[PDB]
Amino acid sequence: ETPPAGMQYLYGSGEASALSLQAYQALLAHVAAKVKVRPADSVILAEGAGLDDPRFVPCGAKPLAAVFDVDETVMLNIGYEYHAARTGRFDTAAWDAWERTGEAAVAPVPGADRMVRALRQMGVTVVFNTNRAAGNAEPTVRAIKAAGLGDAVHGQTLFLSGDDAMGSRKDGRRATIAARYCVIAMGGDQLGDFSDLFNGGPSVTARRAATMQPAIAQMWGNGWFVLPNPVYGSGLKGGFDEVFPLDKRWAAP
Amino acid sequence: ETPPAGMQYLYGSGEASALSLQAYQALLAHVAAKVKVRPADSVILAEGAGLDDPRFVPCGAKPLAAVFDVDETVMLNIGYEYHAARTGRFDTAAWDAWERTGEAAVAPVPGADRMVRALRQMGVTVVFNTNRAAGNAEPTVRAIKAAGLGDAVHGQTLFLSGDDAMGSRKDGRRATIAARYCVIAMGGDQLGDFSDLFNGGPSVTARRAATMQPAIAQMWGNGWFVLPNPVYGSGLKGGFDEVFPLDKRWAAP
Ligand SMILES: [Mg+2]
Ligand SMILES: [Mg+2]
Secondary structure, three states: OOOOHHHHHHHHOHHHHHHHHHHHHHHHHHHHHHHHOOOOEEEEEOOOOOOOOOOEEEOOOOOEEEEEOOEOOOEEOHHHHHHHHHHOOOOHHHHHHHHHHOHHHOEEOOOHHHHHHHHHHOOOEEEEEEEEEHHHHHHHHHHHHHOOOOOOOEOOOEEEEOOOOOOOOOHHHHHHHHHHOEEEEEEEOOHHHOOHHHOOOOOHHHHHHHOOOHHHHOOEOOOEEEOOOOOOOOOOOOOHHHHOOOOOOOOOO | OOOOHHHHHHHHOHHHHHHHHHHHHHHHHHHHHHHHOOOOEEEEEOOOOOOOOOOEEEOOOOOEEEEEOOEOOOEEOHHHHHHHHHHOOOOHHHHHHHHHHOHHHOEEOOOHHHHHHHHHHOOOEEEEEEEEEHHHHHHHHHHHHHOOOOOOOEOOOEEEEOOOOOOOOOHHHHHHHHHHOEEEEEEEOOHHHOOHHHOOOOOHHHHHHHOOOHHHHOOEOOOEEEOOOOOOOOOOOOOHHHHOOOOOOOOOO
């Protein structure tokens, strides 16, 4: 029995490991450049801004920070995905149990513990913005600690689903973070970890086109830093016609 | 019917698109830094060098170049993977037909056509090192052209499996390239696209550990640039015990 190809890739391969280390190398160099030369804009979009003409919450004199998604961005949910592979199960009740009892089965995303330590040695505050539930803040704090990612504090450096009434939408929390910090880098494994504009409607092919809108494309590896996730979530959608465009079809002999 | 999760991710998602654009943004900035300040070492390992103490073919006065894997690094093999998803088939005869007849069903990896044009505008020679077969050089040249990747020439900027007697091992071709160019960046989707030392023996867990050997880890996003591939190849290996380590297991209630 072998696990699903996506988990073999994400959890088992050196390919995925190298991909993640590249992401954090680029982030560390970017942060270091902006620690020496503070920017005028943060990397968080302003309220009402669109992807075509992005405007950003200004950096100002606010303390420097970096924002991170938690799950499959800085922390691997190994125990949970093991159970999903064993069971074949989108199990919301199981995920709730996992938020409460998974602190002993998490690992850092390759390079994320070293990157988080370097950021703090540079004087940059490490802020987590995750859709784990607010009522599970304390076990989530302990899991973050167990992955070697340091100390997170609910409401100061850790923001969770249910901290506002926006549900899985993260823009509201992003606005709260950007109102007190100059956010000079932002990491995630899902497009919703950078803007809610990618979700809540857009099709699979529309979301992929939107990442190549030039004013948005310039962010990738240059303020917005992406970690791989072919195991669950927004990337795992679309029928044959959205995945394989009709001008690129072919059949073997 | 939906395609395999890995193909939904790689071919359909904006997540994979953003991940690829980040890789090429980091590569472009790296190349530009080295065009201004030529390095002493290339990014290609010297003969007999090990991953723990890497030595590199020197840059010297040789003309500047960047080396790229072709398949799923700069070119998406959309037609072929469509057929694999339709058919469920590791089909070596089908892949041979595809090398010969697939030029009309390929697309650039997101950002790869723009990156290849920028490299040439910077005066950097774009060299391809692929395990497509030497006897299919001409259709491979045409497919590279159709993906918007420019003009490749067998034996000058394009090196193929069978150009030497080493089979799928790419070190021999890497040595030939590094003997005439100063290779300042190298891109790939498989660890064999950077060194043969990752393959031919090492286990799934050994290969992943090897990417974090510190002298090697420093390469990722800093000379060695990685593109995602959870669809086929070296990343899709390993049983449950290699993918989900035994100190990170968990079971739902
Ligand atoms: Mg996540
Ligand atoms: Mg390849």
